[PDB]
Design an enzyme around this catalytic site. Structure first.
Site, PDB file in Angstrom:
ATOM      1  N   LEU B  41       0.816  -1.202   0.000  1.00  0.00           N
ATOM      2  CA  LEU B  41       0.000   0.000   0.000  1.00  0.00           C
ATOM      3  C   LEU B  41       0.854   1.259   0.000  1.00  0.00           C
ATOM      4  O   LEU B  41       2.027   1.254   0.378  1.00  0.00           O
ATOM      5  CB  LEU B  41      -0.944   0.021   1.202  1.00  0.00           C
ATOM      6  CG  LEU B  41      -2.087  -0.988   1.189  1.00  0.00           C
ATOM      7  CD1 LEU B  41      -2.824  -0.935   2.507  1.00  0.00           C
ATOM      8  CD2 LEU B  41      -3.030  -0.692   0.038  1.00  0.00           C
ATOM      9  N   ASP B  42       0.232   2.347  -0.434  1.00  0.00           N
ATOM     10  CA  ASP B  42       0.837   3.665  -0.448  1.00  0.00           C
ATOM     11  C   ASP B  42       0.909   4.211   0.976  1.00  0.00           C
ATOM     12  O   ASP B  42       0.220   3.740   1.883  1.00  0.00           O
ATOM     13  CB  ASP B  42       0.019   4.593  -1.351  1.00  0.00           C
ATOM     14  CG  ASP B  42       0.761   5.853  -1.746  1.00  0.00           C
ATOM     15  OD1 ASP B  42       1.924   6.032  -1.328  1.00  0.00           O
ATOM     16  OD2 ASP B  42       0.174   6.674  -2.481  1.00  0.00           O
ATOM     17  N   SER B  43       1.772   5.208   1.169  1.00  0.00           N
ATOM     18  CA  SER B  43       1.797   5.929   2.437  1.00  0.00           C
ATOM     19  C   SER B  43       0.519   6.730   2.649  1.00  0.00           C
ATOM     20  O   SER B  43       0.076   6.900   3.794  1.00  0.00           O
ATOM     21  CB  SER B  43       3.029   6.830   2.489  1.00  0.00           C
ATOM     22  OG  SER B  43       3.015   7.770   1.431  1.00  0.00           O
TER      23      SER B  43
END
Ligand SMILES: CCCCCCCCCCCCCCCCCC(=O)OC[C@H](COP(=O)([O-])OCC(O)COP(=O)([O-])OC[C@@H](COC(=O)CCCCCCCCCCCCCCCCC)OC(=O)CCCCCCCCCCCCCCCCC)OC(=O)CCCCCCCCCCCCCCCCC
Ligand SMILES: CCCCCCCCCCCCCCCCCC(=O)OC[C@H](COP(=O)([O-])OCC[N+](C)(C)C)OC(=O)CCCCCCCCCCCCCCCCC
Ligand SMILES: CCCCCCCCCCCCCCCCCC(=O)OC[C@H](COP(=O)(O)OCCN)OC(=O)CCCCCCCCCCCCCCCCC
Ligand SMILES: CCCCCCCCCCCCCCCCCC(=O)OC[C@H](COP(=O)(O)OCCN)OC(=O)CCCCCCCCCCCCCCCCC
Ligand SMILES: CCCCCCCCCCCCCCCCCC(=O)OC[C@H](COP(=O)(O)OCCN)OC(=O)CCCCCCCCCCCCCCCCC
Ligand SMILES: CCCCCCCCCCCCCCCCCC(=O)OC[C@H](COP(=O)(O)OCCN)OC(=O)CCCCCCCCCCCCCCCCC
Lengths: 606, 87, 177, 155, 99, 128
Positions: B41-43
């Site tokens: 996942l993205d930050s």
């Protein structure tokens, strides 16, 4: 005579007895809050008998029972005044307080200092009934400062919180600014009429009463949170919900309004004081109801509601209708304490959540609180034949049909529309719509303390305006002939406020994101008034309290001129006198110069 | 009022909110599924997960603590420590 | 800016904190959940547009005018959690958070009301006073010269040791005493 | 505590400035004293004049109520900039715009109250008519004197 | 990234000690070890005895002094009968009937 | 575009709208790291005494004692009588005394002149 005065003093002594019980204690109590609730319920029942036998004949008296102090021409006595104002307000206050305490046995149940809380709440009730029953200005000042100090102690209840202590000290600050004018009024009446008793003030009937009425208007500005000295009442919501429900909605904050109503034979003969009260009340009821349109904390919205209603009370004192203002006090107490109790039921059901943007869907989840909140909102806005109809509508019918400051009337009507706007703002964001609160539901309102305490104020908010408005005697002549656009003005303006705010509320579901205007930021940041006045006015004092007074004067210059200059002078002269070189030659040369100055220049041989 | 949280209840609720997130398949998720390494996942997605945790349990997690909770067990342990569960 | 472990915020951390503050203020502006959810996905798209920007001057400039965007579009009364700073219930129970050492000042007739509790407190106090010298000598053998550089503390490296400076973290009061 | 850790006179040489900055536990580049006009500050640092509300509240402070660490050089007006008192925190609206809006609103409302006082509303009626010479004995008129006859007729 | 291994280890150790502390704040079933220690009496002690005290105080100490309890004189209408005199107040003049 | 925030004395500039906040320069890294080191050394020096079981008392703060000594005792030994302090001591020290003197003197002269001419309504004034 013997029944009336006895039960009158029995009410006050009975209220004082749990204070002696909590101060003369050893044990952990077998439900001391139930004891105080039973005490105040029975004091209400006891106080209803002098009220009913006032309704029968108009029987008023004065119990000057204890000579306290005679300052040469001023005989100060423990003097109670049982007239219309005491006879109607004391049962209303006791009934509201009994509801607040049966609410408090539920709400403050997790508090380990619940006995201290009920002690403080009863001390507030005692000081308020010292205020409303007093016959001289000293005893009224006792009750005045007493409700101020219990306001301090009950705002700053959770005293480890910085904002609670700040709000309590703010309330003290604004009320002492009002106390300036109160003590101005006491000074004027003592020096000019030789009295603090109300009877000699009313009988001497002074004509040049501009300055004492300005002092009383300043005292009511401080106490009833009028414009200029308003923000302590929205700050006062930091205390617990029984405190905001009893004190800072219905009972404490009417004491300035009650003060100006109590002096109605002097305000009825002064058109300038009436114009000051009218403009100040219309300014307050405009400004606070305008600020309430965009707030998000529910207790802030109901605090601006009660300050807008106090501004309306100041308006209807300003149009020479003191008994309608007192009727609006007695009417307003029921539904405004009930609206704060409904808000507290919501806040406790949503785990100390006080913001309306995390509410919704509570129409069915909290059905009894929904019913009572709708009934309280309709009593606030002036639904016909609910309790608020029996004073407020008449207020509008007297504010229209009178020789009035027209801008004050027009702002009063704009405030009347704003009341409907923020009332349906409460109903829309809190009860209607869909849920916005967190996902673990602990919604429960099934305590008979909560249900019965809301129920008795619900019966009040239905029937009490009718019952009180048909029991009180006529003290004015009601204006009952007016044109049809002018008779229907309050109801039509209220319905138009509902329609406009329903449009505003239905536009909230839309997918349109606008940047906020300056109008929204002005209505939401409290007219920018606490953002300016609470940053600038303390700054200008406290820097002056340190740079000017503390450091410059009483650490430097008052230290410089008397002691340090004298000490340096005596040091310098001491170093001149004792700087001799021990030479016998120089001392005898000085002796010869001495003899020459003594003979030739001073002539000490003639 | 105020029901007491447990480690099992907090774990159930944190994994429940993460099973309702359409960027995490609910069969690969476990208590140690790292969001950037295991779940990918993205930050920004981690920030949105911590904000959903805040909306779930009702208290703000500060950013100095939000930028370090990188598996659901860290979130459960943080909510446990900030709410004092298993008294 | 101001952090216990790090001396600064990185650019990535500043973007994340602006993103979270923007979504909270957006939720304050966009009260209803579907309407917030729509505009929040739109704001996520606005943050996804400049995600792969490699010029650090350009990314810092975009972050700066995004801060000016946020400062123009903030809510005047944003939603604050009740126990968050600025909340309605924030630091409310701090008057009920009595520290543990006051239990040492109790009278023996009110300590005898709880025999097992104080008998169990005595071994906590004993564990603390035997761990204290080991954790002081652990701190001095591991801290670099010139003092510590960050406010982080080491863990317990040996078996039987407790982590250094642990008592007022473990024995802090509860949030609801 | 001893002598060389107490506040002293205004530093002029850079070594005295460096010893002062080491005394107040701060960097030499951050250590600005008050200007030496003789107001009684001496070597005390001019901290940047912020309230303690602006301090980071999620940071673990040594004094959480004050938001202040141990050993940190306190502001000269620390008792003034407590969170119970004067706030310097950034406002959503500009300060001058707030002052202009509030002064304009208050001045406009007072002007319109003056206008409405100059032009009052009323009802299309005459004066309220009272019997017995506008109630002469009731309003406190003495009975030995006699008022002029105030007479009201039917209409 | 998240925690360092030293931070994870320290938080695990502090967490274990904290959970042991919070568990050890519980109570024993014998604790708190305490030392060994009329239906309407509220209407008698808090109401009726104060009515007795206040009636005695007002009857024999307050009304025995002048102008202490001063009552407003009762309202008199045309058509009343005075109790202390028997003097019938004469009724009003006949009305010019309006409806 | 957007209205620029204008900071004031009592409404300061936000942390995110300050142009020095985005300094990646090595000298600002050195300054932030040295402030971090000072703060961490003071923090460690505090919480070594704060977590001590043998200590029972007050962890004395020489910053606090230093602040009270600057606020109380250091003011006169660092005072110099010059133009600024003399004008501020005459403006704030004897200025309001002169002002309230002339106000109360004019008021009491007016009141006494009205009383000894039989003009002031002093009808019931017998408490004084
Ligand atoms: C009318 C005529 C008759 C009147 C009476 C007599 C006249 C004199 C006044 C009264 C006596 C005052 C003192 C006189 C001696 C001066 C002291 C001295 O020795 O100084 C040197 C020396 C100073 O040197 P220093 O210690 O090295 O320090 C100086 C610095 O280095 C550097 O310092 P510097 O450079 O700044 O200068 C130093 C000097 C410089 O001082 C001056 O230049 C000031 C001169 C006076 C200024 C004010 C004049 C005002 C005139 C009046 C107004 C006019 C109109 C009046 C209208 C009517 C009234 C409204 O200042 C001093 O010495 C200060 C201490 C002495 C103060 C004198 C006060 C005089 C008052 C005058 C009132 C009139 O001091 C000493 O040696 C101290 C020990 C002295 C012990 C013995 C003193 C005995 C005095 C007896 C006098 C009377 C005789 C009695 C006979 C009958 C009985 C037996
Ligand atoms: C449960 C315990 C109660 C007592 C139990 C035993 C008695 C049982 C009851 C039977 C009645 C006893 C006899 C009657 C009582 C005494 C009657 C009497 O004449 O007493 C002499 C007098 C009555 O007044 P007096 O006029 O006769 O004398 C006053 C004294 N001089 C003249 C010098 C000024 O005193 C009292 O009664 C004292 C008690 C008064 C009750 C109220 C006290 C309020 C205190 C408030 C403090 C602050 C007030 C400041 C502001 C005041 C207003 C501006
Ligand atoms: C009290 C009298 C109430 C009845 C008379 C006024 C009725 C009225 O003006 O209704 C307008 C409006 C409802 O109509 P609208 O909102 O346009 O449509 C919704 C879909 N049915 O709005 C309402 O009916 C809501 C406001 C009612 C206010 C009642 C209390 C005053
Ligand atoms: C209002 C009245 C104002 C005047 C009050 C008297 C002066 C102030 C109080 C006495 C002096 C206070 C003081 O402590 O002065 C100190 C100063 C130096 O003396 P030292 O002994 O060195 O100081 C203690 C050592 N650290 O001491 C000195 O310089 C000596 C000062 C002696 C003054 C004696 C009083 C003289 C009064 C009459 C003058 C003619
Ligand atoms: C009928 C006539 C009507 C006339 C109406 C108009 C006249 C009055 C005009 C307004 C004057 C009073 C308002 C200004 C002072 C308000 C002070 C106050 O309450 O400040 C609150 C402040 C912190 O509170 P805040 O920041 O709001 O809280 C947010 C939550 N953390 O708290 C603090 O910072 C604490 C500060 C403590 C010290 C205060 C120092 C200033 C005291 C000012 C006294 C003014 C006396 C005026 C006397 C007049 C006499 C005639
Ligand atoms: C007047 C004036 O300008 O005095 C300045 C003078 C020192 O002058 P400087 O500025 O050093 O050159 O300073 C002096 O000459 C000393 C002080 C002069 C007199 C000041 C009088 C008022 C002091 C405050 C009184 C408060 C009560």
């Amino acid at each position: 005579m013997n029944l009336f005065s006895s039960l009158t003093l029995v009410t006050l002594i009975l209220l004082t007895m749990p204070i002696a019980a909590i101060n003369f204690n050893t044990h952990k109590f077998t439900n001391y809050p139930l004891y105080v609730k039973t005490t105040i319920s029975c004091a209400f029942i006891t106080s209803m008998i002098p009220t009913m036998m006032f309704i029968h004949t108009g029987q008023e008296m004065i119990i000057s029972n204890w000579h306290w102090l005679t300052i040469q021409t001023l005989k100060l006595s423990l003097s109670f005044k049982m007239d219309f104002f005491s006879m109607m307000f004391v049962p209303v206050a006791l009934f509201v307080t009994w509801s607040i305490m049966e609410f408090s046995m539920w709400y403050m149940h997790s508090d380990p200092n619940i006995n201290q809380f009920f002690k403080y709440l009863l001390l507030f009730l005692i000081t308020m009934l010292i205020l409303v029953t007093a016959n001289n200005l000293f005893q009224l000042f006792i009750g005045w400062e007493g409700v101020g100090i219990m306001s301090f102690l009950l705002i700053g209840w959770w005293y480890g919180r910085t904002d609670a202590n700040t709000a309590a000290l703010q309330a003290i600050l604004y009320n002492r600014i009002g106390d300036i004018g109160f003590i101005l009024a006491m000074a004027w009446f003592l020096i000019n009429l030789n009295t603090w008793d109300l009877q000699q003030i009313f009988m001497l009937n002074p004509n040049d009463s501009n300055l004492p009425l300005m002092g009383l208007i300043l005292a009511a500005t401080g106490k009833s949170a009028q414009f200029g000295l308003h923000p302590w009442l929205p700050s006062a919501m930091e205390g617990p919900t029984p405190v905001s429900a009893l004190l800072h909605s219905s009972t404490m904050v009417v004491a300035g309004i009650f003060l100006l109503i109590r002096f109605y034979p002097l305000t009825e003969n002064n058109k300038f004081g009436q114009s000051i009260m009218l403009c100040l009340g219309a300014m307050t009821t405009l400004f606070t109801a305008m600020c309430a349109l965009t707030q998000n904390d529910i207790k802030k919205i109901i605090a601006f509601s009660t300050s807008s209603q106090l501004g309306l009370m100041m308006v209807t004192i300003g149009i020479n209708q003191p008994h309608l203002a007192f009727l609006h006090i007695c009417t307003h107490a029921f539904f405004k304490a009930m609206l704060f109790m409904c808000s507290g039921s919501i806040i406790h059901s949503l785990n100390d959540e006080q913001d309306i943007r995390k509410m919704g869907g509570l129409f069915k989840a909290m059905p009894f609180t929904t019913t009572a909140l709708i009934i309280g909102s309709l009593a606030l806005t002036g639904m016909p034949f609910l309790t608020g109809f029996y004073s407020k509508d008449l207020i509008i019918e007297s504010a229209n049909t009178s020789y009035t400051n027209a801008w004050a009337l027009l702002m009063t009507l704009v405030a009347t529309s704003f009341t409907a706007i923020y009332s349906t703002r409460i109903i829309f964001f809190a009860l209607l719509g869909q849920p916005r609160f967190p996902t673990l539901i602990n919604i429960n309102e099934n305590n008979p303390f909560l249900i019965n305490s809301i129920k008795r104020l619900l019966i009040g908010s239905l029937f009490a305006g009718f019952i009180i408005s048909n029991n009180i005697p006529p003290m004015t002549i009601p204006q009952m002939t007016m044109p049809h656009y002018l008779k229907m003005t309050a109801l039509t303006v209220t319905i138009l406020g509902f329609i406009l705010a329903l449009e505003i509320s239905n536009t909230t579901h839309y997918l349109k994101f606008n940047y906020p205007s300056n109008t929204f930021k002005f209505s939401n940041l409290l007219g920018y008034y606490p953002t300016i006045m609470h940053r600038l006015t303390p700054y200008m004092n406290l820097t002056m309290s340190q740079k000017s007074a503390s450091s410059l004067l009483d650490l430097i210059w008052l230290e410089t001129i008397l002691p340090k200059t004298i000490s340096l002078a005596q040091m310098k002269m001491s170093t001149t006198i004792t700087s001799q070189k021990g030479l016998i030659k120089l001392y005898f040369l000085s002796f010869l110069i001495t003899i020459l100055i003594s003979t030739t220049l001073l002539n000490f041989h003639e | 009022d105020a029901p007491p949280l447990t480690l099992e209840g907090i774990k159930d609720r944190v994994l429940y909110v993460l099973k309702l997130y359409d960027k995490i398949d609910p069969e690969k998720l476990s208590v140690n599924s790292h969001f950037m390494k295991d779940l990918g996942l993205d930050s920004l997605d981690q920030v949105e997960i911590i904000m959903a945790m805040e909306d779930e349990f009702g208290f703000e997690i500060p950013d100095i603590d939000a930028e370090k909770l990188m598996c659901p067990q860290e979130i459960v342990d943080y909510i446990a420590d900030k709410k004092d569960v298993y008294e | 800016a101001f952090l216990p472990s790090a001396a600064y915020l990185t650019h990535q951390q500043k973007v994340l904190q602006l993103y979270k503050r923007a979504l909270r203020h957006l939720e304050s502006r966009c009260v209803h959940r579907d309407k917030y959810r729509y505009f929040a996905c739109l704001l996520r798209a606005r943050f996804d547009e400049h995600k792969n920007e490699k010029d650090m001057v350009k990314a810092t400039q975009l972050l700066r005018e995004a801060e000016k965007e946020f400062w123009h579009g903030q809510h005047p009364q944003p939603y604050i959690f009740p126990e968050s700073p600025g909340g309605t219930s924030y630091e409310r129970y701090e008057c009920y958070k009595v520290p543990e050492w006051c239990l040492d000042d109790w009278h023996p007739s009110e300590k005898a009301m709880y025999p097992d509790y104080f008998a169990k407190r005595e071994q906590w106090k004993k564990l603390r006073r035997e761990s204290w010298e080991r954790e002081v000598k652990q701190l001095q053998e591991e801290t670099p010269v010139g003092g510590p550089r960050t406010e982080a503390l080491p863990p317990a490296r040996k078996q039987g040791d407790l982590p250094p400076l642990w008592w007022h973290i473990v024995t802090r009061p509860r949030e609801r005493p | 505590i001893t002598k060389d850790m107490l506040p002293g006179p205004y530093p002029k040489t850079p070594e005295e400035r460096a010893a002062a900055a080491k005394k107040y536990n701060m960097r030499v580049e951050d250590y600005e004293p008050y200007p030496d006009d003789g107001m009684g500050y001496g070597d005390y640092p001019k901290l940047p004049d912020r309230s303690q509300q602006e301090r980071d509240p999620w940071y673990d402070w040594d004094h959480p109520d004050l938001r202040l660490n141990w050993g940190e050089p306190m502001h000269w007006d620390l008792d003034m900039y407590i969170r119970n008192r004067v706030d310097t925190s950034p406002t959503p609206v500009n300060w001058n715009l707030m002052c202009k809006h509030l002064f304009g609103f208050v001045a406009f409302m007072l002007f319109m109250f003056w206008v409405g006082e100059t032009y009052p509303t009323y009802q299309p009626v005459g004066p309220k008519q009272y019997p017995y010479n506008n109630l002469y004995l009731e309003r406190g008129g003495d009975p030995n004197k006699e008022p002029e006859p105030v007479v009201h007729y039917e209409i | 990234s998240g925690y360092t291994p030293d931070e994870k280890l320290r938080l695990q150790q502090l967490r274990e000690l904290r959970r042991r502390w919070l568990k050890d704040q519980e109570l024993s079933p014998r604790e708190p070890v305490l030392p060994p220690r009329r239906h309407s009496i509220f209407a008698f002690t808090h109401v009726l005895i104060p009515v007795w005290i206040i009636h005695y105080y007002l009857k024999y100490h307050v009304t025995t002094k002048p102008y202490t309890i001063v009552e407003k004189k009762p309202r008199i209408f045309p058509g009343d009968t005075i109790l202390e005199t028997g003097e019938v107040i004469p009724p009003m003049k006949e009305f010019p009937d309006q409806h | 575009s957007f209205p620029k925030y204008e900071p004031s004395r009592l409404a300061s500039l936000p942390t995110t709208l300050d142009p020095a906040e985005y300094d990646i320069s090595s000298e600002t890294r050195k300054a932030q790291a040295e402030r971090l080191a000072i703060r961490s050394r003071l923090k460690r020096e505090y919480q070594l005494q704060y977590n001590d079981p043998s200590r029972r008392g007050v962890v004395e703060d020489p910053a606090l004692i230093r602040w009270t000594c600057a606020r109380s005792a250091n003011v006169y030994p660092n005072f110099r009588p010059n133009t600024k302090t003399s004008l501020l001591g005459a403006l704030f020290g004897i200025g309001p005394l002169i002002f309230w003197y002339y106000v109360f003197k004019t008021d009491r002269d007016r009141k006494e002149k009205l009383i000894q001419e039989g003009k002031l309504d002093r009808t019931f004034n017998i408490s004084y």
